[PDB]
Design a binder for these strands. Structure first.
Ligand code: APC
Ligand code: APC
Ligand code: MN
Ligand code: MN
Ligand code: MN
Ligand code: MN
Ligand code: ZN
Ligand code: ZN
Lengths: 351, 345
DNA sequence: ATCTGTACATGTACAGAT
DNA sequence: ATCTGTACATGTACAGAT
DNA sequence: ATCTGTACATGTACAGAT
DNA sequence: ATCTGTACATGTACAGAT
């Protein structure tokens, strides 16, 4: 029943194969262009992230996320007004500086210009660059070989120092993945992507946001308290399956209802990270109990909506569901929709 | 009772501190000599190994193992007979015996250098132990004034795929898992100048892999961590090591046995019984008793396969006589059936 | 002659197809 | 249950640069 | 190239709580 | 007796400086 829904959401190998071949060609060509001698982005490296590379993409392989990450040694960070997530950042990049402050907007604008130039010279493939969207750190490619595929090329600064202080009590995996895992994860770099809002606030053009997309990918692919969870000599859990179901519920509601424009799949991802922390035992995600596991995720998400509280998993003081970011009305609208589907056998899964 | 024995075997923080301070001085000075000096071993790097660095040393901090590992440009290995563990090495040109990199020549120069440097140490009472023909180590004897031995082990580091003899080894797939096993086998492998029984042959070492396993020994990621549950795996290893050590002190008949037999056996047992709840501290007695039963079965079948190299039998007749295994069997069974009176010594 | 940034070589987990 | 395409970590060969 | 600084894992040690 | 919290000690991966 839920299993039949998962059957419908499963990607097909033929679609995967055809989509990846084209995405890989485009991305490699753009990455090579970035290495040309006079490029401010020479030395940028690729990191594939997001649902496709975590194996939780649903319905079709039609949206791919790729970070083009540039190491920026000897950075000093200044927190933007105690928000925990947003920072000012203070030589190939000297053209993007205003005094000692690195402009996210100048740097993103040049990045976009280079990508557009290279895209125009692709005659192989039907590909174009989507109009910039406010609040996005990405240059998005629209590929039509024939099926529509979007690729988000995300500009990111790489810093190898210790993670900012706002993350100190974040990543609360000690009871689940453990202390050695958390220590090792926090020794990896952290990333900053352009905030890129057009909201008339101070430093609009120069504000960067923390990204832990690499850490999140690791977690999704190494998600059990037991080392053998979902391995060929261990037991299958239903953690990724619950994430896929919850993502589908949101995707379906969002297609129908403009009232839900403020919500995105990262809200669901964040909520399930909290549930995986609350219920760390693999036996609490037994496949035989798929319905009750999905049901408890739903109940948890409803509580987050109704109490207006969903803390960023890495930055606990940052509340993704504050009234400042999302209206009461929107949260209540979504709450009623979720409770309806839950209590009437998920008719939206049949559409 | 077993817990009281463990209390006696526990190292004291003050002894640890005093022993490590002296060991670290001597080791650092030898490692530095191997460098800025125009030695064939320039670029050798330190890797601490064995029971002290795995936190399973018992009784006193009086025996330390250190590898001085040298990366060597793509070598070619030829298995010695079909021993699995021993190899001739081809492509430091000073250490060739017509094209083969001689374990004896290379170890001899290494040992010469260490001896020379040791003679110039004036602040610490340290000497080099007479060479043992079976040993890949240059062994130091420190009087601190307590007696401390340090094994400085020369090792070639190779970054290639592990040799074919290890293909079915490291059988951790059901315990630590496939990602762990794959990642482990992506690390280098080591060759130490332990001769086959000759002079040119080298032997495989996985001391780095063994150390990782002892530090990451649970099916659960949180085993023995501050937000997980304590298991009794290392405590059973300590107890079994002490039983062998005590029997070996009393009976010369047991000279062919060593702690690495016990280590190998418990690796096998941890693979057979992977679940952390099968090693609950409340069940220390049962756990130690099943380790004993397992070891007795290894003795009775004359079979103890190297954990990494399955065709290498540490209990073959060629290495250990039938009578020696039977002698040990009887001793172990006596201690087991009389409540371990040797633990009270 | 050597050095090297770039891309191929090797190996296998994950999960879809049969 | 087996077979099989993709992703990806790490080793290494080498055209072009020095 | 080498070396120090940081962070926190692994331990010992012991009082107070359970 | 064990568990839990704090203090005190060593080992170790790796960034950044030199
Ligand atoms: N607001 C945010 N805060 C932190 N990280 C974010 C974020 N938005 C996106 N990300 C990161 O960037 C990745 C890609 O984002 P999206 O493409 O928008 C979604 P997704 O996780 O890939 O699933 P989907 O594309 O199937 O909906 C996320 O997986 C997450 O790691
Ligand atoms: N026969 C062998 N084969 C492979 N590796 C061996 C070996 N003998 C010793 N080693 C490696 O070298 C390490 C140190 O060896 P030893 O000092 O002889 C023992 P130990 O494991 O340190 O315990 P112990 O010194 O408390 O008795 C071992 O732990 C192992 O990793
Ligand atoms: Mn995505
Ligand atoms: Mn995206
Ligand atoms: Mn030792
Ligand atoms: Mn030794
Ligand atoms: Zn799982
Ligand atoms: Zn444990």
């Amino acid at each position: 029943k839920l299993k039949k829904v998962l059957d419908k959401l499963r990607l097909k190998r033929k679609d995967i194969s055809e989509a990846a071949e084209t995405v890989n060609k485009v991305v490699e060509r753009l990455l090579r262009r970035m290495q040309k001698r006079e490029s401010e982005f020479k030395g940028v490296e690729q990191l594939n992230t997001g649902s496709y590379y975590e194996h939780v993409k649903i319905s079709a392989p039609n949206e791919f996320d790729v970070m083009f990450k540039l190491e920026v040694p000897r950075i000093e960070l200044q927190e933007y007004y105690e928000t925990g997530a947003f920072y000012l950042v203070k030589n190939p990049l000297s053209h993007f500086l205003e005094g000692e402050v690195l402009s996210a907007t100048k740097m993103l604008s040049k990045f976009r210009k280079i990508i557009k130039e290279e895209v125009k010279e692709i005659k192989d493939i039907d590909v174009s660059v989507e109009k910039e969207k406010p609040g996005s750190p990405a240059v998005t490619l629209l590929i039509r070989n024939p099926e529509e595929i979007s690729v988000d090329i995300i500009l990111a600064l790489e810093s190898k120092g210790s993670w900012p202080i706002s993350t100190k009590e974040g990543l609360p995996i000690q009871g689940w993945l453990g202390t050695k895992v958390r220590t090792n994860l926090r020794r990896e770099p952290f990333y900053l992507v352009p905030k890129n809002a057009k909201d008339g606030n101070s430093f609009q053009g120069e504000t960067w946001r923390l990204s832990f997309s690499h850490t999140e990918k690791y977690i999704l692919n190494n998600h059990g308290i037991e080392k053998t969870c979902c391995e060929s000599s261990g037991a299958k859990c239903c953690r990724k399956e619950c994430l896929k179901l919850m993502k589908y519920l949101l995707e379906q509601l969002k297609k129908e209802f403009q009232e839900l424009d403020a919500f995105c799949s990262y809200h669901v991802k964040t909520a399930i990270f909290h549930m995986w922390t609350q219920d760390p035992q693999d036996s609490q995600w037994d496949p035989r109990n798929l319905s009750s596991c999905f049901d408890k995720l739903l109940a948890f998400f409803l509580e987050c909506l109704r109490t207006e509280k969903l803390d960023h998993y890495f930055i606990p003081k940052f509340n993704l569901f504050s009234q400042e970011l999302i209206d009461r009305k929107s949260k209540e609208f979504l709450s009623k929709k979720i409770e309806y589907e839950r209590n009437n056998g998920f008719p939206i899964f049949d559409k």
